[PDB]
Amino acid sequence: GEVASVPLTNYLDSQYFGKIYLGTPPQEFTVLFDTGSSDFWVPSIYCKSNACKNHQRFDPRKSSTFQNLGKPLSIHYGTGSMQGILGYDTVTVSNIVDIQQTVGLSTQEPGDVFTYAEFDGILGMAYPSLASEYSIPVFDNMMNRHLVAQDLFSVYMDRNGQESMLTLGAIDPSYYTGSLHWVPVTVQQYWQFTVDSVTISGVVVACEGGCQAILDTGTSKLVGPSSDILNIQQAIGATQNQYGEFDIDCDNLSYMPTVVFEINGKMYPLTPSAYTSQDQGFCTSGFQSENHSQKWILGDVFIREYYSVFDRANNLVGLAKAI
Amino acid sequence: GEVASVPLTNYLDSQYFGKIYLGTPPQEFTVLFDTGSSDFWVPSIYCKSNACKNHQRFDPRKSSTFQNLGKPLSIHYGTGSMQGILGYDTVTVSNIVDIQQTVGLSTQEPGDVFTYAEFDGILGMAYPSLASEYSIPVFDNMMNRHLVAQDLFSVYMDRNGQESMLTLGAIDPSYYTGSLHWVPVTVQQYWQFTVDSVTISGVVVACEGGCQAILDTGTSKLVGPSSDILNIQQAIGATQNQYGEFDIDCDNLSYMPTVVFEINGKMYPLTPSAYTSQDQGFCTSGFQSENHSQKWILGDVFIREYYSVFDRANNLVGLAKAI
Ligand SMILES: [Cl-]
Ligand SMILES: [Cl-]
Ligand SMILES: [Cl-]
Ligand SMILES: [Cl-]
Ligand SMILES: [Cl-]
Ligand SMILES: [Cl-]
Ligand SMILES: [Cl-]
Ligand SMILES: [Cl-]
Ligand SMILES: [Cl-]
Ligand SMILES: [Cl-]
Ligand SMILES: [Cl-]
Ligand SMILES: [Cl-]
Ligand SMILES: [Cl-]
Ligand SMILES: [Cl-]
Ligand SMILES: [Cl-]
């Protein structure tokens, strides 16, 4: 029954990541705390890929508490893949000591997807139904052993600065204004819920009649079905460039529409500033299309605007305007 | 992972009750399945009170699986009290076999409160925080040992007939029309939630600005704070008689107001037929005052109109219009 404050870092267009420790004595890693997945893995000495060469690698030879399970682990992240082997060791996340935790030790991380990522590994924070075979999600172990004060965690992403924070077991009202609104999880695998509509000036531009969405800290953009995202890219004045990216004129923010997500009867507006990312003298749309799905992904673009609480005890998502 | 269908019976103005079995071999009892409490008890051979004389008494001498814990149990029901001693035995509720279940064996049930009650004992179905010391709620044992298919139960009360039903582990859409609406539990002790307002023709007559309420199968009436209930007794044309009861003219139902509870943005109307009980050539108000509380109790008057699902996995109450 403890609380862990995990400061999150991000560089430019990178994901948000933070520190955990693994083994006895503790070995340090940066991980993507990822509400879009449920497995926990880090690079290991058994991985020779370029990506592993560029990241911290777990050395089980130096841990008195490591135990190999031998079971394969395979995951996808972006267009890349990781292959590894599951074992047990002790994970420490500030206050919290999570012994005998299943963890993948990578063996293969081919390609450049993981090489230039800022994090070493991924710590999934979604439901066990999303976990790979033989894998037990870290937060589930924490809950089942009553290691956390409450069975929830909170994520604050600093739109402007470096005060981002993941809190295990508590909610910090200092990171938001107004009150938290609670949204029922519809399908317990991702952190999934119903979006009622997406509007501009009261006109429905997407999600007509309702759609499913997930709240995903491990995705940067706001992802939706082709035809809906088209409506939005046109409305915000985004246009495709050679890289396939949708660019927005940074100096036009003042003239662009506010895109409002209605979730469980409450409004979650995204201003042009919010949905436009400025990674240079170039601004890009924070909206992105998917072709083989109608399920929305509310990634960091959304979370930066709305402090997010993930409540396993009640199967709710809490949203409040981020400070 | 099973389902139990427990038929519920009621006679005239009695509570609703159903059958469970206790001991090895099984001994039969009728119990009040009571979402307003969390303890489980039945009369025993060690109780000589009149009330025990008029009810089935558990004989541990005949059960090979009984174990006395010796710990006292004390409960209140209506204006009466039960004193007993906790032990373990096996409870059977149709499909479901719940071994080593804490159960109070009564020793003292003085006064007439329990004597003329139809049930032998009480099986509380609220949260563990409401349970007496050393007592483990039956449904919590069922959930913790994965004895039920889903961690919820559903209650249908037949306003007109004898088709009432308690279902452990499932929801039966045949008992309701339209769809279930889910209401968040605010305080996990009783099945408690927020009522937004109580209105007649759109005018707020009670619960101005919101109030707390519980959904309680072990209470007959709809209970609220003095001043609010006054507004309602006056509006429905109820008047006090010598017995302190509020009587309603049965032939005036057609002229009386509909009293609407707004809960989580949805309307739950109670027609004059619904809130008027006809236990003879006399009709009485289903509303009742309480003086030392502002927390409403939505008892059988409400549940008869709205099929009720109690969901422990999600800490929700589900409501739908009863058939
Ligand atoms: Cl990254
Ligand atoms: Cl799950
Ligand atoms: Cl909790
Ligand atoms: Cl907290
Ligand atoms: Cl809601
Ligand atoms: Cl939908
Ligand atoms: Cl589409
Ligand atoms: Cl703006
Ligand atoms: Cl009774
Ligand atoms: Cl509790
Ligand atoms: Cl369940
Ligand atoms: Cl069901
Ligand atoms: Cl209130
Ligand atoms: Cl009052
Ligand atoms: Cl009527």
Q: What is the DSSP string of B171-222?
A: --GGGEEEEEEEEE-SSBTTBEEEE-EEEETTEEEESTT-EEEEE-TT--SE
**Is domain A172-323 annotated with CATH 2.40.70.10?**
yes
Strand partners, A259: A270
Q: A-chain residues within 8 Å CB-CB of B182?
A: 184
Residue with the two structure tokens 């709240």: A215
Q: A-chain residues within 8 Å CB-CB of B315?
A: 313-314
Read off the tokens for A79.
């267009």
B237-244 long-range contacts (CB < 8 A, ≥24 apart) are B238/B284, B238/B285, B238/B287
Question: How was it solved?
Answer: X-ray
Q: Do A184 and B314 touch (CB under 8 A)?
A: yes
In this structure, are residues B180 and B309 in contact, taking their beta carbons and an 8 Å threshold?
yes
A184 touches chain B (CB under 8 A): yes
Which are the contacts of A254, defined by CB distance < 8 A and separation ≥ 6?
A272
**CA-closest candidate to residue B253, choices B235, B240, B271, B268:** B271
Ligand 4 center–CA A168 separation, angstroms? 9
CB atoms within 10 A of CB B179: 11
In this structure, are residues A300 and A15 in contact, taking their beta carbons and an 8 Å threshold?
yes
Q: B-chain residues within 8 Å CB-CB of A191?
A: none
Taking the C-alpha atoms of residue A171 and residue A254, their distance in angstroms, rounded to an integer, is: 34
Q: Relative to the alpha carbon of A148, which ligand is closest?
A: 3
Half-sphere exposure of A280 (CA within 13 A, CB side): 4
Burial B58-86 (b: 16+ CB within 10 A, else e): bebeebeebeeeeeebebebeebebbbbb
Count of pairs with CB atoms under 8 A, one residue in A, one in B: 12
Ligand 15 center–CA B289 separation, angstroms? 22
Read off the tokens for B28.
């039969």
Whether residue A25 is preceded by a cis peptide bond, meaning omega within 30 degrees of 0, is yes
Comparing alpha-carbon positions, the chain A residue that sits nearest to B181 is A184
Active site residue A151: no
Which are the contacts of B137, defined by CB distance < 8 A and separation ≥ 6?
B38, B39, B40, B124, B125, B126, B127, B128, B131
Domain boundaries, chain B: 3-171, 172-323
Q: How far is A314 from chain B (nearest CA, A)?
A: 5
In this structure, are residues B166 and B153 in contact, taking their beta carbons and an 8 Å threshold?
yes
Half-sphere exposure of B140 (CA within 13 A, CB side): 20
Sheet holding B165-168, edge to edge: B4-7, B165-168, B152-156, B306-311, B316-322, B176-184
The CA-CA-CA angle for residues A224, A229, A230, to 5°, reads 155
H or E stretch covering A110: none
CB atoms within 10 A of CB B243: 8
Residue with the two structure tokens 């007794």: B233
A210 touches chain B (CB under 8 A): no
In this structure, are residues B83 and B107 in contact, taking their beta carbons and an 8 Å threshold?
yes
Ligand 9 center–CA B120 separation, angstroms? 9
A314 touches chain B (CB under 8 A): yes
In this structure, are residues B135 and B104 in contact, taking their beta carbons and an 8 Å threshold?
yes
Q: What is the DSSP letter of A1?
A: -
Taking the C-alpha atoms of residue B102 and residue B94, their distance in angstroms, rounded to an integer, is: 18
Q: Which of A34, A39, A98, A140 is catalytic?
A: A34
Provide the pairing of β-strand B259-263 with B266-270.
Answer: antiparallel
Q: How far is B313 from chain A (nearest CA, A)?
A: 7
Helix (H, G, I), strand (E, B) or coil at B166: strand
A273-281 long-range contacts (CB < 8 A, ≥24 apart) are A274/A159, A274/A301, A274/A304, A274/A305, A275/A222, A275/A236, A275/A301, A276/A236, A276/A248, A276/A250, A277/A13, A277/A301, A278/A250, A279/A12, A279/A13, A281/A250
Taking the C-alpha atoms of residue B123 and residue B101, their distance in angstroms, rounded to an integer, is: 12
B278 touches chain A (CB under 8 A): no
**CA-closest candidate to residue B176, choices B280, B308, B294:** B308
**CA-closest candidate to residue A270, choices A309, A219, A232:** A232
Backbone φ and ψ for B304, nearest 5 degrees, come out as -60, -30
Strand partners, A30: A19
Q: Which of A89, A120, A216, A311 is catalytic?
A: A216
Ligand 11 center–CA B192 separation, angstroms? 20
Q: Relative to the alpha carbon of A250, which ligand is closest?
A: 8
Q: B-chain residues within 8 Å CB-CB of A182?
A: 184
Taking the C-alpha atoms of residue B313 and residue A314, their distance in angstroms, rounded to an integer, is: 7
- The DSSP secondary structure of A224-287, one letter per residue, reads EEHHHHHHHHHHTT-EE-TTS-EEE-GGGGGGSPPEEEEETTEEEEE-HHHHEEESSS-EEESE
Q: Do A3-171 and A172-323 fold alike per CATH?
A: yes
Sheet holding B287-290, edge to edge: B192-195, B211-215, B296-298, B222-225, B287-290
Q: B-chain residues within 8 Å CB-CB of A315?
A: 313-314
Half-sphere exposure of B159 (CA within 13 A, CB side): 21
Taking the C-alpha atoms of residue A113 and residue A117, their distance in angstroms, rounded to an integer, is: 7
H or E stretch covering B300: helix B300-303
Which are the contacts of B311, defined by CB distance < 8 A and separation ≥ 6?
B151, B152, B182, B317, B318
CB atoms within 10 A of CB B48: 11
Q: Across chain A, which distance is largest between two alpha carbons, in Å?
A: 61
Which are the contacts of A4, defined by CB distance < 8 A and separation ≥ 6?
A93, A94, A95, A96, A148, A167, A168, A169
CA A228 to chain centre: 23
Q: Do A313 and B315 touch (CB under 8 A)?
A: yes
Helix (H, G, I), strand (E, B) or coil at A29: strand
Given 2.40.70.10, 3.40.225.10, 3.40.50.20, 3.30.70.580, which CATH number is that of A3-171? 2.40.70.10
Comparing alpha-carbon positions, the chain A residue that sits nearest to B186 is A314
The CA-CA-CA angle for residues B88, B92, B96, to 5°, reads 120
Read off the tokens for A93.
């996340």
- Burial group, residue A244, by CB count within 10 angstroms (0-12, 13-18, 19+): exposed
Sign of CA dihedral A59, A63, A66, A68: positive
Strand partners, A219: none
Which are the contacts of B291, defined by CB distance < 8 A and separation ≥ 6?
B226
CA A30 to chain centre: 14
In this structure, are residues A138 and A118 in contact, taking their beta carbons and an 8 Å threshold?
no
Catalytic residues of B: 34, 216
In this structure, are residues B84 and B41 in contact, taking their beta carbons and an 8 Å threshold?
yes
H or E stretch covering A176: strand A176-184
In this structure, are residues B154 and B133 in contact, taking their beta carbons and an 8 Å threshold?
no
Ligand 12 center–CA B251 separation, angstroms? 41
